[PDB]
Amino acid sequence: KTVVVTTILESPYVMMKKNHEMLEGNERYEGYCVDLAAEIAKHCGFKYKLTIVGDGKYGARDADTKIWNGMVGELVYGKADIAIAPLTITLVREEVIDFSKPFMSLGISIMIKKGTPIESAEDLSKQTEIAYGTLDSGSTKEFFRRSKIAVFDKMWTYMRSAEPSVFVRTTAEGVARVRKSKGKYAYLLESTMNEYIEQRKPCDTMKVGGNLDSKGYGIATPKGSSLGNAVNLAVLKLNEQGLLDKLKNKWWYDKGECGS
Template identity: 25%
Template sequence: DAPFIMYKPENQRGPGIDAFEGYCIDLLKLLVAELGFNFTISLEPSNIFGELLEDGNWDGMVGQLARREMDIAIAPLSITSFRQSVIDFTKPFMQSGLQLLISKPNRNADFFAFLRPFSPLVWILIALALIFVGVVMYLLDQYSPVDLDYGNCFPGLRSRFGSTNSFWFAIGSYLQQGVEAYPRSISGRLLATFYWFFVMVMVASYTANMAAFLTTSNLAVPVSSVQDLTKQSAIDYGTVIDSEAMDFLKSSTETVYRNAWSHILENSKTSLLNSSLVGINKVRRSKGKYAFIWYYPELEYAALRKPCDVMVVGSKFDLRGFGIGLQKNSPYRDVFTLAALKLQERGETEKLRAKWWDQQTQCPPSTSSAADAVELGVNNVAGIFMVLGGALMLATILLIIELFMFKFCVSRASSKRTMRQVCLDRYFK
């Protein structure tokens, strides 16, 4: 079972232990260096860890240990109460548990992905904001006393914000581009200031959320737990026959696992497989139609290797440890347990895990969540729209104040001086 025990490439194989590689092989070498013992390595012929047969005997590695045909078994051998009744175990050298292996969903091309950071309603509100700002900017230009006064002094230059320029100002500001005409009145400048603040917040929100969409996979995972599997019929699922995983599902008293076992039993020809390698390869070939229930160290390794078409999902369950198996009442049990603990304390087992998992990565990290990046809805941006709405109302109020003040000031000035004198004093003095 990769990456615990694997054959080396043919051109690199040597005699005995040098024909193999993997986590357990390296662990065995560390134990040899720690304890200084000699050994002869052999493979279990049926490639089975060990299950209790109907006649009361055990097969696989557990059976060989129970019959005293070998002294120790170094493999991803789960520690269970049934096995401990016939063999001994060291303390666990690795923690394990069951998870799901599924095919990575295909990501469909999205030609309008640039619209995803905002919800449709927010895009509509942005368009309405552009229109309202353009209209109000035009009205401020037409009725502001500052612009009227400037037009009276320079008739050819009065209107800077006609209907076209007003909307061009609104669009250009939103796209963060400069425009030729800017407001002269206090009300117009106040509206422009708050509008630019609105644009700054919206652009920053769009950029941040777009980055989130681009940097997360956003894969639509069809199932993420055994419970999800039992609620659907499109995806078949199963595990290895006569394995600890099968025994757990078979003997569990929890409804969700009982339902899962019922499905597996009804579809045993396709659901129960001969080995974990067969299960992993079946997931790869199934194109999303099969999920494999197995122990996560092996599933994690498979998900890290090319062709990068599978992923591990769901929470771990049936948590248990992998230990070194020994004959019942073996005098070596405490010796190997103490040696394994020393290796853990020195960080040797963590180094082995990093070597055979972290450093074997051939695929980019994937996520089982489809909601890492969520489009911004109205509730997320309502505040900035309120600020813009308040600015529109405040600009209108300032326009009214400007009209009254200008009317009062001009009426007093024009009674004593000509319009030419007023213009010269205001713009050239």
Template identity: 90%
Template sequence: WWFFTLIIISSYTANLAAFLTVERMVSPIESAEDLAKQTEIAYGTLDSGSTKEFFRRSKIALFDKMWTYMKGAEPSVFVKTTAEGVLRVRKSKGKYAYLLESTMNEYIEQRKPCDTMKVGGNLDSKGYGIATPKGSSLRTPVNLAVLKLSEQGVLDKLKNKWWYDKGECGAKDSGSKEKTSALSLSNVAGVFYILVGGLGLAMLVALIEFCYKSRAEAKRMKVAKNAQNINPTSSQNSQNFA
């Protein structure tokens, strides 16, 4: 049992270390810079939208380099709809990254099957607005109301409520995508297989040993009985000669 205890502790420690290493494995792409300097993972945007226009009009060298790659990539890295882009990410097995607005990105990653993630920070910052007719008297009240909601944190609370609290992939993890899972019995099942195998082998050895000893004991008793049968005869013969 001391040997089994030593084995199970060693196996548990080794499996736990490997398990946590896999859980905390860092993605090879952590930023737009990482994406731009490699060609193994393709990346693209919605074929018509603000994200594509952002790259097309950007004067920043990094984004211009990314745009040059995207417009010349074969097959095309652009998609017709966001749903198509997300589906392409899921089917690519890590070989395609879809660039889209962070709000939509964060919403999608909180929906089943929970197999997508946002990588890196935002490429730029822009907000959403409420359109009103030109010269409308509603413009100023709406602007003030939106600013007030933002200052009071109401907009952030609403986003957390509908994006994360009602999400299907668990609570938001403080901006970190690392999740720690429990080490299940299947992760250390090998130890118990060894135990069962060891018990089976021990029982087989015990059975063989029992049979061997029983046979040896039977032979010993048979020899002893034969010796007893011989001894009286020898004694009688000795008396006759006397």
């Protein structure tokens, strides 16, 4: 049987090829998660079809209806066999689906326009001349909203009350705001995306300081799925063989536009 893989279009994980109209099936797509899916399938011995999650979401449980959306929902309700995507291992997701050990690490990080005089979260928190914010929804805003840590609590109070709004609707809007604000806006986002954008023309942004937290992306399967064991062993093997490091270097740096 062909294994149904649910994933999401986000660069550089999964992208439609420029010439996709001339291609078929899995060959329409490229990226880190496309390469990872092929390696997993080869090690586990299965054929697969890449499908893009209908609602474009990662996975959260609606407060009112209690229905899981996104890739997580596709697994929970039995519509897909596996999710191969930048999907973070979190407590509430682990309660409803199985996860491999993580294939990539990340944490919340600061993006500045080059030249901005900020080196750390502590620096941002202690000032207001350089405004700073997050996506208007999702996991990074939630991190600050929920934090009991003093520095991050202070940052949340500032962001929630800052005018005009320091929040943005999309990643692209956050990046454009950093680039157009003459050093007066810093954007808080996942370190993996920050690193990727640091390698996009016009090469005017950079990641600064240590990460604010630590977490990992994992491959997800329905709870109790037999496929989960083999997939987890494959991730651990690909890590030890150095293949995951090779794939991150390929998509972030070999294909990067801003030099070393």
